[PDB]
Subunit: 224 residues, 4 copies
C-alpha cells in the first residue's frame, strides 16, 4: 500500500489520456479533405467518464474514484478541516497524469500531418479574460463528487460510479464549446510537454483553483 494506490492511480489516468486524445484527434485522418466534427469531442466526454468507473476504485483505491488534478485537490481540502494533511494522493495524481501524457504519443503522432496540435492553445477567441467558463465547469464535477460523498442516508439507494462519468461528461461538452479546451490541468500539461510551443498560460489552472475554492465555500454554506 506504501505505493499501491499511486501505481493504480497512475495506471488509470494513463489510459484516460490516451482515450481522450484518441477521440479528439481521430477526426480527419485519411488523405481526404476537411470535414470538422463537433459531436466527436462530446464523445470524449462520456469515454473519459467511463474509463474512470472502469477502475473498480473500491479497495484498489479510496472513496473518490479517479480524480483529476483540480478535483483531487478540491476534495481533500473540503474533507480536511480539523487538520491539513492529505497531499499524497495529489502528488500521486499529478505524477500519474505526467506518464499518461507520455504514452499518448504513439502512432498517432507519426501518421499525422505536420500541424496536428494535440490540444488547444488560445481556445476560441478571448484574451486572458475568457476564463470564467472553465471556472464554472470545474465546480460542477468538484461539486458532483462533493455532493455524492456527503448526502447518503437520504438520497437514492445505490447505482454505479457512472454518475460522475456523465456529469463530467457534460461539463466537458459545455467547456469544450469553442474555448477552454482542457478542463483540468493534467490533460493540458501533458499536451504542452510533447510537440508544443509553450504559451499555455495555465489559465485553465488558475481557474479551477478559484472555482474549486468557490465550490468549497458554497458547500460549507450548508451544514458542517
Amino acid at each position: 500500500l506504501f505505493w499501491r494506490a499511486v501505481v493504480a492511480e497512475f495506471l488509470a489516468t494513463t489510459l484516460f489520456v490516451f482515450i481522450s486524445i484518441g477521440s479528439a484527434l481521430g477526426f480527419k485522418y485519411p488523405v481526404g479533405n476537411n470535414q470538422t466534427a463537433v459531436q466527436d469531442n462530446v464523445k470524449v466526454s462520456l469515454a473519459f467518464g467511463l474509463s474512470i468507473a472502469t477502475l473498480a476504485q473500491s479497495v484498489g483505491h479510496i472513496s473518490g474514484a479517479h480524480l483529476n488534478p483540480a478535483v483531487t485537490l478540491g476534495l481533500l481540502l473540503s474533507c480536511q478541516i480539523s487538520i491539513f494533511r492529505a497531499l499524497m494522493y495529489i502528488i500521486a495524481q499529478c505524477v500519474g497524469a505526467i506518464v499518461a501524457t507520455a504514452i499518448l504519443s504513439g502512432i498517432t503522432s507519426s501518421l499525422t500531418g505536420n500541424s496536428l496540435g494535440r490540444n488547444d492553445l488560445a481556445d476560441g477567441v478571448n484574451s486572458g479574460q475568457g476564463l470564467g467558463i472553465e471556472i464554472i465547469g470545474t465546480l460542477q464535477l468538484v461539486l458532483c463528487v462533493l455532493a455524492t460523498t456527503d448526502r447518503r442516508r437520504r438520497d437514492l439507494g445505490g447505482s454505479a460510479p457512472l454518475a460522475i462519468g456523465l456529469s463530467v461528461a457534460l461539463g466537458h461538452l459545455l467547456a469544450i464549446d469553442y474555448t477552454g479546451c482542457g478542463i483540468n490541468p493534467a490533460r493540458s500539461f501533458g499536451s504542452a510537454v510533447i510537440t508544443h510551443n509553450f504559451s499555455n498560460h495555465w489559465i485553465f489552472w488558475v481557474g479551477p483553483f478559484i472555482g474549486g475554492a468557490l465550490a468549497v465555500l458554497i458547500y460549507d454554506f450548508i451544514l458542517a
Copy 2:
C-alpha cells in the same frame, strides 16, 4: 432555515441559466462563417438536467429537487388540497431565477457580434396559436415529478435524481424543435430583461399554466 432553502434555490437556478445559455450561444463564435448546429441545443437538455441533480437537494432542500417556475407551482398545487398555503418556495424560485439571468451576461455578451439574441422571440413560424406544443412538453416534466413523488412502495428500488434531468432533457429536445424556445418562464424572463426588445408575449407562460393545470386534473383521475 428562515432564508436558507431560498438562497440555496437561488444558487442552483443561477448556474443553470449560465449553463444553458453557455451551450445555446456557444455556437458560431470565432471570426469564421455560419455553420448552425441542432445537436447543441439537445446538449442543453441534458446539461440542465444534470445541474439540477448536482444540487444534493436532500436536506439542503425539500422533496422536489430543483424546480423551475411552472413546475414549482404545479407541484405545490397538487400537493396542497386540504388547504392552499405554500407559495413561499414559488417566490423563492422566481427570485433565484431573476439573479440567474443577471449573471448570465458576462464575457459572452462582450465578445458577441451585434446581433446575438440570447433567446427566442417569435419561435419558428406561427401566430399566437402555436403554443400547444410547449403546453404538452410542460405537463411532461410536471407529470414526471408528480409521478415520481406519488408511486413509491411499488415502483423500483432507488436510483438517482437524474430521472427528471433526462425527462426534462427530452421535453426540451421536443419543444426547442423550431418553435417555443424557452420551456418554462424563468429562462425567458431573464432573456427579455437584458439586451431585449420586448414582445415575449409570455405566451410560454400562459401555456404551462393551462398545461400544469391539465396534468394536475389528469393525475386526480387516479386515486386521491
Copy 3:
C-alpha cells in the same frame, strides 16, 4: 376499474403519438430550404421511451407499463398458456392508439407545406420482401419486456422503467434506418387515417405477428 386502465392507457399512447410526430415532422419548417436530419428520428426513440415510463404504470396500470400493439399481444400470449383469455388490454390499447392519432393533427398540419406526409409509405427501396428488419426489431422490445418480467430473484436489484424506453429507443434507431418507418401498428394506422393515400400494406403489421410469434417460441426454449 371497469374502464379505468383503458382510459389511462388511451391517455398514454395519445401523448406518445403527439410526441413522436412532433419530433419526426419538426424538421425543415420555416420558409427556409432543405436540410434533412437523421439525428432527429433517433431523438424520437428516446422521447417515446420516456413518455412510457412517465406513466407511473404501477397501480394505475398492470405489470407491463405502456404497451404498443404488437407488444401488447406478444406479452398476453406468452403470459397465458393454461388458458387464452386476456384480450381486453389489447382492445384497450388499439382504441387508445386510434385517439392518439386523432389529436396528432393540430397546428402541425395547418402550417405545413402541401406535401407533409406524416409518415412512411414504402419505406426506403424494397418490394414487399424487405420486411425482415422490422420483424427482428420487434422481437427486441417484445423480448425486452418478456425477459424483464421473467428473470427477477437473480438479476439486479431495482432501477426504473427506462430500461424498455431505451431498448425500444434503439430498436427504433435500427428500424427507422431508411426503411420500415413505423415499428408497431398503432403509429402507422393513425398515420394512414388522416391525410393519407392508402397503400400501407400493413406489411409492418404482418411482421411483428411473425416476429412476436418467433420471440415467444424462443423464450419457451428456456424453462416453462
Copy 4:
C-alpha cells in the same frame, strides 16, 4: 444443459451481428447520392450493448452475460488459476459467432450496389503497426466485466447489465474512429466469410490476445 447455454449463446450473437451490420450498412441506400454519416456507427455501439442485456443471461446462461471472443477468453483465463479447464463456453461463442455472420446477409446484400463491403479491410491508413488502438479498446470491456465481477460487497447496490453495454458502446466509438473497424474477432470473421477478398490480417485478433493478456496481468496487480 449439455447443449443449452451453447444454443442460447449462439442465439444471442446471431441477432447481434444482424443488429450491428443493419446499423453500419444502413447508410446511403436509396438511389440518392453520397452523404456519409459518423453518428451512425456510434449507434451501433449502444444497440450492440442492448442486445447483450436483452439476453436475460441469468439462469439461461452464466455470470458473464453475452461475451464476444476476446472477452470470452479473457474472463475464463483470469477466472481459472488453480486449473485450466473452461474452453467449452469459448468454442460455444465462436460457433454462435459463425452462424450470426451467416444470417447477416439477407436482403441487405441483394439490394446493395456492387461495392457494399460489409466491413473494414485495412481500416484507415496505417501499416500493420496501427493495431495499438484496438488493443487498448479491448482491455476496456475485458476490464469492465472483470471489475464488475470482482468488486461486489462494496460497490453499488444493483442496477442492470447495461453497464457493459454502454462501456463496450464507447470503446466502439473510440475504436471505429477511422481505423480498426471490428473490435473483437467474431464480427470480422463472419465479414470475411461472405462476399470478401481475404486480407483481414486478423491483426485485430492478434491485438486483443495481447490486450486481454495485458488486462489480466494488470488485474492480478491487486489482490489475488
